[PDB]
Symmetry: D6
Subunit: 160 residues, 12 copies
C-alpha cells in the first residue's frame, strides 16, 4: 500500500525539466551582459561576477536533474534487494545540491546590489545584477519541488 | 449531454501553446536591451526593470500552462468520483494566474512610460519600454481564452 | 461535382506556412534595431515604432493561420449539416485579418520614411525603416493567397 | 526510353535545398549590419540598401523552390494527359526567377562598391557591401542548377 | 546755462566701454559651443545659429560705440556753427543701433528655447541657447544708457 | 578730525579690484563646462544653470565696483555742499548689490548639489556644480569689505 | 576479398559530418566581427576580408560533403558495370576540393596577421584575424580524412 | 564474472554528452567577447587569446567523445579476438586527450588573469578572462569521468 | 583747397583697425572647428576647407592694412614731387586686395553650404560653415570703407 | 645699524610676484581637467576636488601677497611710532597664511593619489591628480621665502 | 651717396615683425590638433608630426629676427671700421635661415598630404595637415623680404 | 682692459628671455594633453608624466633667469670689493641649473618613446610624447648660451 510516490516522482521529474527548459536559456541567457559595475576599471566586471557567481542556479539544477535521473536509467538496465541502494543515492545527491545553495548563495534571496573588493578592482565597488527577484522566484519552485521529491523518497524508503 | 467542452479545452490548450511559442522568444526576447532610462546613472535600468517587471507575462503564462496541464497528465495515470478534484484544481490555478496580473500589472494596458524612484537612482526618472501596445494585444488573447477555459470548466463541473 | 477546392486549401495552407517560416524570423527579426530616427532624444525610437507598428504583418498573419486552422481541427474531432458553420467562420476570420491591414497600415505599400510627433519626441521627426519594399512584396503574396482562399471558400459554400 | 531526368530532378531538388540551408541563414544573416556607407547621415544606409537590395538572392531562391515544388505536390494528389501542364508550369516559373535576377542585379557579379543618390542622402555616396565575391559564387551554383533543371525539363517535355 | 551733459556723455562713454570690456569676451565668448540642438543632423547647429544670431548684441554695441565715438574725434581735429552737424549725426546713429535690435531680436527678452526649420535641418527642431537671462540683463543697461545719451543729446541740441 | 576713511576707501577699492582680477577669469572661467547634470536629456544643463545662475557673483561684483567708482570720477570733474549727494549714492548702490545676493543666492553658502524641475527636463534632476566652497570663500571677502566700505561711508557721512 | 573500405567510408562520412556540425556554426560563426584592421577607414574591413576570405573552409567542406554524398544517393536509386563511374566521380571531386585549398589558402597554416592594399584602403594595412591556430587544427583533420577517403577509394577502384 | 563496466561506460557516455550539450554552447559561447585586455592596441586581444587559448576545453572534449565513440560503432559493424584491439585503442585515445590538457593548460585551474608579450602587443599586458572558476568546475567532472572510463576499461581489458 | 581727405584717411585707418581687432580674433577664431562635413572620411574637412578657404578675409584685410600703412611711414621718413608716387602705390595695392576677393570668394555673400569633390574625399560632399551671414556683414564694412579710401585718394591725387 | 632688511623685503616681494606670475596661470591652469577619478559616476570628480582642494596654493599665495602688500601702501600714505603697528600686522598675516597650509594640506607634499568617500560617490574611490611633485617644488620656494620675510621682519622689529 | 637701405631695413624689420605677430599665434596656433592621420594607432600622430615638423616656419623666423636684430643692438652700444663686421654677420645669419628651409622643407610648397613609416606606426600611413596653402603664402612673403634684406645688405656692404 | 663681457651678458640676458617668451607658452603649452599612453588604465598618464617630467625645461630655465637676474638687481641697490661675491653667486647658480638637467633628463636628447612601470599602471607601458625633437633643439640654445655666460663670467672674475 504505497508507490503513489513513483507517479509523483515522474510527474515532478517532467515538471522540473519543463520548468527548466522554458525559462532555461531565456532568463540567465543575458547573465553576463547585464552585470553593470559602477566603475571604469576593465575586467572588474568579470572578476566580481566570478566571485559572486561561480555557477548559476540553472547549471547546478541541471546536474541535479542528471544525478537524480541516473538511478532511473541505472536501475532500468540493472539485471538485463538491489533496488533501494539506488533510491538512497537519489536521496543524498538531491540533499547535496540543496545544501550547496544554502552555502554558496546567501540563502536564495539574491540582492539587487552587491559589493566587491577583489584585486584588479581598486577598492569596494558596487556591481548591480539583472532580475534578482525573478530568478529567486524560480528558485522557490525548484527548491520546493526538491524538498517534495526528498520527502516522498524518504517516506517510501521507509518500507522494511 | 455535455463534454463538448473537453474538445474546446484541448483546442484552446493547443491554441495557447501555439500562440505562445510563435511570439514567445520573439517578442520579449529583447525585453532587457530596450528599456531605456533617461539618465546616465549606472544600474538604474536594472533596478527599475526589476521594480516594474518582476516577471514577464510570458513566464507566468508558461507556468499557468503547466499547472493547468498537470491535471491532464495527473488524471491520465490516476488508476494504472476521483475525477473532478482535478477539475476544480484546474479552475483555481487558472483563476489564480488571472488574479495575479490584475494585481501586479496596472490592469493589462502597459504604459509607454513609467517612473521610478528607487535607491541607486537619484530621484524620479523616466524609463521607457518597448512595444507596450503589442504585448498588451497578446495579453487580450491569453486572458480572453483563460476566461473561456474557466467558464466552460465551471459549466461542466456543474454535473451533480 | 466540386471539392477540388479542398485540395487547393490544403495546398495554400502549407504554402502560407512555408512562405511564412522561411522569411519568418529572417526578415522582421531585425525590425527593432533598424528603425533609425534622426534625433538624439532617447526613447523616441520606441515611441514612434509603437505608433506606426502596433503589430507586425507576420504576427497577424500567424494568428490568421491559427483561426483559419481551427475549423480544420475543430471539424476533425467534431463527432468522435454541422459542417459549414465551420466553413463560414473560416470565411469571416480571413476577411477580418484582411480588413485590419487595410485599416492599420496605409494600404500595404510601406513608406521608406514616416513622421512622428508623439510626446517624449519634441516635434515632427523623421524615422526611417528597414526593407519596406521587401516586406511589402511578401504582403502581396499573403494577401493574394488570402483572397484566393476566401474566393474558393465562397464558391464551395454555395452548394445548397 | 527516358525518365532518367525524374531522378536528376529529385537529386537537384534535394541539392538546391541542402545548398541553401547550409549557407542560408549563415551568409546573408549579417546582410544588414555590414552595409557601411561613408557618411554620417542617418538612414542613408537603409535607403541605399533598399534601392540596391529590394530582395536578397536567398529569398527569391526560396520562392523559386516553392513554386517549383508545387507541381510535385500538386500532381501527387491530382486524382485521389493532365500531367504535363504541371511540367510546363514548372518550366515557366523557373525561367521567371532566372530572368528576374538578370534584371534586378547587374548580371550576378556583385560589386564591392556601389553608389547611391537617393533623397535623405545628400548626393552621390559610397556604400560598401559584405562578401560580394562569396555570395556570387553561390549564385553560380544556384543558377547553373536552375539551367540544368530547365534543360532536362525541356528535353523530357519533348515526348509527344 | 547747459553743458552738464558733456560730462554725462563722457561719463557714460567710459561707462559703456567698461561695461562692455568686462563682460565682453567673457559672456558671449562661449556663444558658439553652447548652442545645443536636439538632433543628430550635422550642421543644423550652425544654420540655426546663423538664422537667429546674424550678429551678437556685443558686436553691434561695439560699432555703436565707434560711430558715436567718431563725432568726438571728428570734431576734435575739425579746424586744426560746424559743431552740431556732428551732434545730430551722433543722434541718428545711436537711434539706428537702437531700432535695429527692436527689429532683429524679438524685443530684447531672449528665449531659453527657439525653433528652426531651415534646409539641411529636417523639420522644426528645438535649439537651446546659453544664458539668455544674463545677456538680456546686460542689454537692459546698454539700451537704457543709450536712451539717456540720446535724450540729453536731444535736450542740448535744443540751444538755438 | 576725520577722513582717515578716504584712505581706507582707496585702499579697499584697489583691494577689491586686485582680489577680483586675480581670481576673476581664473575661477568662474570654467563655470559652464563643469555643471554636470545626471541625465542624458539635451539642454537641461543650460536650463538649470540659467535657473540657478542668472548671473555670477563676479559680474555683479564688477558692476558694484563701477557704480561705486562712478561717484569718484563724477565728483572729480564736478566743477571744472554738492559733495555728499555723491557719497549717499555710493552708500545706496553698495547696499543694493549686497541685498541682491541675500535674495538671489540662498544666503552665500553655495550648495555642492541642487535640483531642477524646469520644462525640457523630465522631472526633478540632480545637477552638480564646481568649487562651491572656493567661490563662497571669495564671497566672504567681497561681502565683508563691502560692509566695511558701507560702515565707514556711514560714519563719515555723519559730519553735519 | 575487399570492401572493408565501404565501412571506413561510411565511418568517415559520419565522422566528417559530426566533426563539422559541432564546430560548424560554433567556430567561424564569429568570422566577420573579429576581423580587426588597424585603421579608421570605413569598409576596408569588408574589402580585405573579401580579398583573403572569398569562402571559408567550412563552406567548401560542406559542398565537398555534398558532391561526395551524391554518388551514394545517385547509385542507390540507379536501377529502381554502372557502379564505378560513380566511384571515379567521387575521387575527382574530393581531389578537386583538396587542390582548391592548396591554391586559395597559403597551404593551410593561417597567419595571425595579413596585409591588404585594396582600393578604398589607403595603402598597405594590417588586418588581424581570430583563432587562426584553431581552425588550422580542424583543417588538419578534414584534409587528413580527405586523403584517407581518396586513398581507399583509389585502392578499391583497383579491382579489374 | 564482469561486464558491469559495459553499463557504466554507456552510462558515462550519455553522461559526458548530456553534461556537454547543456553547458556546451552556453558557457564558452561568449569566450571571445569577454576577453578584455587593458590596452588600446588593436588585435592584441586576438593575439593573446590565440596564445593562451589555441583550443577550448569543449572542442577537445568533443573530439575525445568522437574517437572514444568510434570503437563502439567500429566494433558494431565489424563482422556484418578482434574485439579488444578496439578496447585498447579506446584506452590510448582517452589517455591522450587527458595528457594534452595537463600540457596545454597550466594543470586545469584557469587563472583570472594572464599576461601576454606577443608581437603586435607592445610589452607585457594584462588580459583578463571570463568565468575561469566555472569552466574549471566543469573540467573537474569531465576529467574525473575520463579517469573512471579509463580505470574500468583497464580492469576489464585484464581478462586473459 | 583740399586735404580734408587726409583727415578722413586717418579716421578710416583707425576705423578699419578698431573694426578689425574687436571682431578679429573673436569671429574667425573658431573658423576651423566649426566646419562640419557630412561624412566619416578623415581629413576631408581639412581638404575642403583648404579648397574653399585658402585664406580668410581677415588675413588679407590685415596685409591690406600693412601695405596701405607702408606709404604713411615710408613717406614720413622720406627726407630725414616725391610725395604722390607713394599715394599712387597706396591706390593700386588697395584696388588689388579689392579685386582678389571678387575673384577668390564668389562675390562676398558666403554660402551656408558648399560642396567638395577633392581626392581623399569620395565624391561630392556637403560641408557646412559657421556664421556666413555675420562675416559677410563685416565684409560689407571693410569693402565699403576700402572704396571710400580709394575714391578720396583718387580725387586728391587729381591736383596737377 | 639695520635696514638691510628693507632691501631684502622689496627683493623678495618682487621675487614672490615674478615666481608667481610665470608659473601662475601656467601650472594650475589645468587644475580641473586633469583630476581623473576611476569611476563612471557623474560629479564625483567635482565633489572630491572640492573636498581636497577647497583652494589652490596659488590663490592663498595671492591674498598673502596682498595683505602683506597692504602695510606698504598703507604706511606710504599714512601722514599725507605709527610705523611698526603696520610691521607687526605684516608679521601676523604672513604667519597666518603659513599656518593655514600646515592645516589644510597634509604638510606640503601632495600625494599622487587620494581617496574620497563623499555622498554622490558610492564608496571610497581613487582620484588622481596632475603634477603633484611640481607644485610641491614651487611650494618649497614660496614657503621658504615666507619664512625669510618673517624672520627678518622679526629681527628688525626688535629695535626698541 | 647711399644709406637709403638703412631706412628699408628698418621698414622691413618692422614689417617682418607686424607680418609675424598678426598671423603668429593665429595660424599655427592650431598646428597640433589638426594633424589627422588615417589610423587608429596611438601616438603615430605625434611621431609623424615630429618627423615632418621638427620646427615650424614661425619659430625659425622668430630666431632669424633675433639674430638679425642682434647686430642692431650690438652695434648700438658698441662704444659707450668696427661697424661692418656686424653687417657681414647680419648677412650670414639671414642666408643661414634661408638655406635651412630649402633643406628641411621640400622647397616651401607644403603638401596637403604626406606619408609616414616610423616605428610605432605599422607601415606607410597618410597623415593630412591643416592650411598648407595659407602658410605657404606667408612663407612667400617672409622669404621674399629676406632676399631683399640680403640683397640691399650686400649692395651697401660694397662701399670700400 | 675688459668688460666687453658686461655687454654680452646683457645681450644674452635679453636673448634668453626673448628666446623663452616666444616659444614659452607656445611649445610646452600642450605638454599635458599630448602625452598618450597605449593603455586604457585611468591615471597612468598622469603618473608616468610625473615620473618622467617632474618639471619642464622651461620652468627650470625660468628660475635660472631669476637667480641669475638677482645679482643684477641685488648689486644695483647695494649701497644706496662687495661686487664679485654677487658675480661668483651668479656663476654657481648657473652651473647648478646646468648640472640638474644632466641629471634629471637623460642628457638633453628627449626620447620619442619612454616606458613606465609605476603602481596604478599594470606593468611596463609605452607612453609617447609630443615634439621631443623640437624642445631638444631649444635646449641646445639655452644650454649653449648658459655655457657662454658661465665662461665669460669665469674669465672676467679672473681680474685680481
Amino acid at each position: 500500500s504505497t508507490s503513489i510516490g513513483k507517479i509523483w516522482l515522474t510527474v515532478l521529474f517532467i515538471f522540473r525539466i519543463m520548468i527548466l527548459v522554458v525559462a532555461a536559456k531565456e532568463v540567465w541567457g543575458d547573465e553576463q551582459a547585464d552585470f553593470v559595475c559602477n566603475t571604469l576599471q576593465p575586467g572588474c566586471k568579470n572578476v566580481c561576477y566570478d566571485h559572486y557567481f561561480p555557477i548559476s542556479h540553472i547549471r547546478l539544477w541541471a546536474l541535479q536533474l542528471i544525478f537524480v535521473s541516473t538511478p532511473a536509467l541505472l536501475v532500468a538496465m540493472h539485471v538485463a534487494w538491489t533496488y533501494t541502494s539506488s533510491i538512497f543515492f537519489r536521496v543524498i545527491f538531491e540533499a547535496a545540491f540543496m545544501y550547496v545553495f544554502y552555502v554558496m548563495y546567501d540563502g536564495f534571496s539574491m540582492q539587487r546590489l552587491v559589493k566587491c573588493n577583489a584585486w584588479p578592482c581598486p577598492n569596494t565597488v558596487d556591481c548591480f545584477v539583472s532580475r534578482p527577484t525573478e530568478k529567486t522566484v524560480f528558485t522557490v519552485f525548484m527548491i520546493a519541488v526538491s524538498g517534495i521529491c526528498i520527502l516522498l523518497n524518504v517516506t517510501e524508503l521507509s518500507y522494511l
